[PDB]
A paper describes a structure:
We also investigated how a bactericidal BamA-binding antibody Fab fragment, known as Fab1, affects OMP folding in vitro. The structure of Fab1 alone was also solved by X-ray diffraction to ~3.0 Å resolution and this structure was flexibly fitted into the EM density map.
The folding and membrane insertion of OMPs is catalysed by the essential β-barrel assembly machinery (BAM)2–4 which in E. coli comprises five proteins (BamABCDE). The major conserved subunit, BamA, is a 16-stranded Omp85 family member that contains five N-terminal polypeptide transport-associated (POTRA) domains that extend into the periplasm to scaffold four lipoproteins BamB–E5–8, all of which are required for maximally efficient OMP folding. The POTRA domains are also dynamic, with motions of POTRA-5 also occurring alongside changes in gate conformation, with POTRA-5 plugging the entrance to the BamA β-barrel lumen in the lateral-open structures, but moving aside when the lateral gate is closed.
Author numbering:
A (entry chain L): 1 to 212
B (entry chain H): 2 to 222
């Protein structure tokens, strides 16, 4: 039984620079390797066969290097769409097919200020007994961002949950959603609902609110 | 797609389930076909492989014969039937193809159909409109969305205008709330002039609960 070890698990690089993903084989495979790229929210696809030959539709930037025990994948001047997870594949041992652990390639882009939006709970959700107020950060970088809820100048905690999307395949930016979940009663107990966002792209914390 | 994978969404541990995969734009009769599953967290595992005339069938040692893979050339369908299911087996199943007289390495993968085994019962999602505030005059850009709440298990498919709207759309990863049910928000950014002139409808589908909702979002009065 053959073992496909891949390190490091997570990698990062700027836009335009090259990346080398290492793949090590337990049985010194005789140049019988395949490299696969998995885009976010998408099925993995073949990048390199025979461990040195490029696939028909993939761009020349991707390159295959190495042999025997050790292999490497080279990405040249990677674009925003290159954000992905890369795996190895052996076919030397036909009975058991094994993959690598997977390298998570992230990218480094310039600073992007998030566009803040605020969403009141629908009047059909008020018949449910629970109210959900949603805060939206659309296209920002880096991932580091502070989102705080403000009601009548009250810092809400333990009731809100954040969610960060995977890095976009076009501009390589992040998207965050801060969901505030309350009861219908307390939703109508207060007048003004506000969302404050502190981010690197902003010169000063941007707050957006509604009074219902 | 080329390989579409219609199969079960939720099942009970100890029960059985038959997954199907159909090929559309290629011949599918000279290509070796295999089933490969990935559990969320980016762990990829190959479970089965079958030959062109089902002469050679290979299974993983974790499976040990528990799964049975067959294929029909006339109907262009690949079948994987799982007799015994465990909690660890819950994963995303990929219908995978091989390469014509080049290698025994894979080339093409389907969308993937995820199976989730759990003693818990299925629960339908509730959709609530995320209406866009009036702002940004006319030169600015506004955003609108849909909120999916209280659904189990994963996954849910959310799209806009039946696939007509694919740009500027962000479907946030599902977050797990204290009630034990999933909840996520899907948003999209559109120009302010489009509002009141263009109709935006988000379609949400939950296969295990058989929930198909076409929900329309208009600005609040």
């Amino acid at each position: 039984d053959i073992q496909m070890t891949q390190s490091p698990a997570s990698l990062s690089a700027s836009l335009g620079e090259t990346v080398t993903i290492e793949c090590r084989a337990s049985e010194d495979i005789h140049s019988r390797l395949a490299w696969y790229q998995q885009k976010p929210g998408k099925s993995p696809q073949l990048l390199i066969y025979n461990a040195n030959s490029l696939h028909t539709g993939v761009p020349s930037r991707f390159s295959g290097s190495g042999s025997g025990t050790q292999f490497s994948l080279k990405i040249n001047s990677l674009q925003s769409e290159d954000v992905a997870s890369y795996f190895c594949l052996q076919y030397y041992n036909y009975p058991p097919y094994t993959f690598g652990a997977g390298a998570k390639l992230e990218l480094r882009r310039t600073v992007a200020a998030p566009s803040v939006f605020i969403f009141p709970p629908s009047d059909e959700q008020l018949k449910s007994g629970t109210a959900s107020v949603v805060c939206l950060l659309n296209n920002f970088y880096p991932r580091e961002a502070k989102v705080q809820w403000k009601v009548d100048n009250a810092l809400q905690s333990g009731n809100s949950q954040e969610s960060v999307t995977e890095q976009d395949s076009k501009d390589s930016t992040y998207s965050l959603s801060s969901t505030l979940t309350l009861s219908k009663a307390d939703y109508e107990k207060h007048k003004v609902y506000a969302c404050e966002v502190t981010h690197q792209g902003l010169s000063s914390p941007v707050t957006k609110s509604f009074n219902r | 797609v080329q390989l579409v994978e219609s199969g079960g969404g939720l099942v009970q541990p100890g029960r059985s389930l038959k997954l199907s995969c159909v090929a559309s734009r290629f011949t599918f009769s000279n290509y070796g076909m295999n089933w490969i599953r990935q559990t969320p967290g980016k762990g990829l595992e190959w479970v089965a492989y079958i030959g062109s005339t089902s002469s050679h069938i290979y299974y993983a040692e974790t499976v040990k014969g528990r799964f049975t893979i067959s294929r029909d050339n006339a109907k262009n369908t690949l079948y994987l039937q799982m007799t015994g299911l465990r909690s660890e087996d819950t994963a995303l199943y990929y219908c995978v193809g091989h390469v014509r007289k080049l290698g025994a390495f894979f080339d093409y993968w389907g969308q993937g159909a995820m199976v989730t085994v759990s003693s818990a019962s299925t629960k339908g999602p509730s959709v609530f409109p995320l209406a866009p505030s009036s702002k940004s005059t006319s030169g600015g850009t506004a955003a609108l969305g849909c909120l999916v709440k209280d659904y189990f298990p994963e996954p849910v498919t959310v799209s806009w205008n039946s696939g007509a709207l694919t740009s500027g759309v962000h479907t946030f990863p599902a977050v797990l709330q204290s009630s034990g049910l999933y909840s996520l928000s899907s948003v999209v950014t559109v120009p302010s002039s489009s509002l009141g002139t263009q109709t935006y409808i988000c379609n949400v589908n939950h296969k295990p609960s058989n929930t198909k909702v076409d929900k329309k979002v208009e600005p609040k009065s």
